[PDB]
């Protein structure tokens, strides 16, 4: 009777930036999703492909838990068929997603009087991200036609921008912690049943 380690993901002390979203693999344990679904503490709890209403009687090959932090107005972007900063350049979900998305306000933890500038997002890229792709490069983006030559200046921007997280910001500009659970189903024993 091994319990699935969801405490290390949901109750973690420090989270990762959206461009460097953290991935954890969960296998060979028993998960009680009714505990999460009946917590009355999550602002957003939306599940695609599967029905959240007591459908824990299914066996899955693996569970990928992806953790990051965004602002409130961007939470709508974490869904299939969405466009925007996060969906295009930071975190993209496939159109045939089968999983669960949980997001809750974290203004009491991730905010910082004076500004929490350690949460970043990528603003410039040459092309859109493929689903479940991660980019951690810091190459200078070429906006015009003059090469940057590795230095920043006119039409030469650092590709990362910083969130400004303060307790006095509006709901649309307050931190939100997001955990995405992806359920893999392949020709495998599928040891993750979780009765």
């Amino acid at each position, epitope marked *: 009777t091994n319990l699935c380690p969801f405490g290390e993901v949901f109750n973690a002390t420090r989270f990762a930036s959206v461009y460097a979203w953290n991935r954890k693999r969960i296998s060979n344990c028993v998960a009680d999703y009714s505990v999460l679904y009946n917590s009355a503490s999550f602002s957003t709890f939306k599940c695609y492909g599967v029905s959240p209403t007591k459908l824990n009687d299914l066996c899955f090959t693996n569970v990928y838990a992806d953790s990051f932090v965004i602002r409130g107005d961007e939470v709508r972007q974490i869904a299939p068929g969405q466009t925007g900063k996060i969906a295009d350049y930071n975190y993209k979900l496939p159109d045939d997603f089968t999983g669960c998305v949980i997001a809750w306000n974290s203004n009491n933890l991730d905010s910082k009087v004076g500004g929490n500038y350690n949460y970043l997002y990528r603003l410039f890229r040459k092309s859109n991200l493929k689903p479940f792709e991660r980019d951690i490069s810091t190459e200078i983006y070429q906006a015009g036609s003059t090469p940057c030559n590795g230095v920043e200046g006119f039409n030469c921007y650092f590709p990362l*921008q910083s969130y400004g997280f303060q307790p006095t910001n509006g709901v649309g500009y307050q931190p939100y912690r997001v955990v995405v659970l992806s359920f893999e189903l392949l020709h495998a024993p599928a040891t993750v049943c979780g009765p």
Partner: antibody
Framework: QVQLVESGGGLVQPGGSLRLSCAASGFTFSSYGMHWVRQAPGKGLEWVAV????????YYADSVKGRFTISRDNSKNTLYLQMNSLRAEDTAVYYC????????????????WGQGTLVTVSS | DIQMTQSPSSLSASVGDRVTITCRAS??????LNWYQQKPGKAPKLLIYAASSLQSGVPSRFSGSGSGTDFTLTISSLQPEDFATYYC?????????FGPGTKVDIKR
């Protein structure tokens, strides 16, 4: 060269309607977000609305919420602003500006500005 | 909303002088401040972006410096084409707010 041209101003009775257009030439229209700014006679600048590169994120000011609507056509290279329930304090000159990114939510500047168009509301 | 204050409201300077203008925010905005210039009857111009970064075509006499809730715009040598109205704008969050504006006029 990059430039923007406004058209659609004039005189409207209070409670009426209007629609201004701003046509852009010189740059790629689909790779930038666009803003609307306004200036009252003898007053300062006031930001109105912002639209992204594909019209999926719109934000308005508290004084124009509900009444105003922003839109854009990428095939015609045009930016439209529609004003319903026009008030007597909406009389101003309007400018269309272009941002440095596709979204325009934070960390940006209005590099190109248009000539501006006058909208007067009086009975 | 973030309230922006400029100091002063009107400054009289002569040709060849050094002009400093101060903008102050009601909440930390990091380096998300821009400086614009407007002349009567014409569209506003872009002078400074991202706290301290000159714009192409702007003469090297303009400079900006600041971070947080205090910023400064400086003109080293004044020229007859610099008497105009100057605005500071924050690009931190919507709605975007400008300053009241500082007007520079020829001294006598």
């Amino acid at each position: 060269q990059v430039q923007l041209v406004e058209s659609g101003g004039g005189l409207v009775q209070p409670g009426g309607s209007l629609r201004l257009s701003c046509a852009a030439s010189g740059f790629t229209f689909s790779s930038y977000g666009m803003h609307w700014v306004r200036q009252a006679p003898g007053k300062g600048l006031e930001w109105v609305a912002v639209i992204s590169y594909d019209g999926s994120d719109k934000y308005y000011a508290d004084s124009v919420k509900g009444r105003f609507t922003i839109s854009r056509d990428n095939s015609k290279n045009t930016l439209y602003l529609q004003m319903n329930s026009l008030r007597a304090e909406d009389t101003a000159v309007y400018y269309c500006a272009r941002d440095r990114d596709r979204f325009g939510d934070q960390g940006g500047w209005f590099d190109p500005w248009g000539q501006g168009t006058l909208v007067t509301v009086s009975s | 909303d973030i309230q922006m204050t400029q100091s002063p409201s009107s400054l009289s300077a002569s040709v060849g002088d050094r002009v400093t203008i101060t903008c102050r925010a009601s909440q930390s905005i990091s380096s998300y401040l821009n400086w614009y210039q407007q002349k009567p009857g014409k569209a506003p111009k872009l002078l400074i972006y991202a706290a301290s970064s000159l714009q192409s075509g702007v003469p090297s006499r303009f400079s900006g410096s600041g971070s947080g809730t205090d910023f400064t715009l400086t003109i080293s040598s004044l020229q007859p084409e610099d008497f105009a109205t100057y605005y500071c704008q924050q690009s931190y969050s919507t709605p975007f707010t400008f300053g009241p504006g500082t007007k520079v006029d020829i001294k006598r």
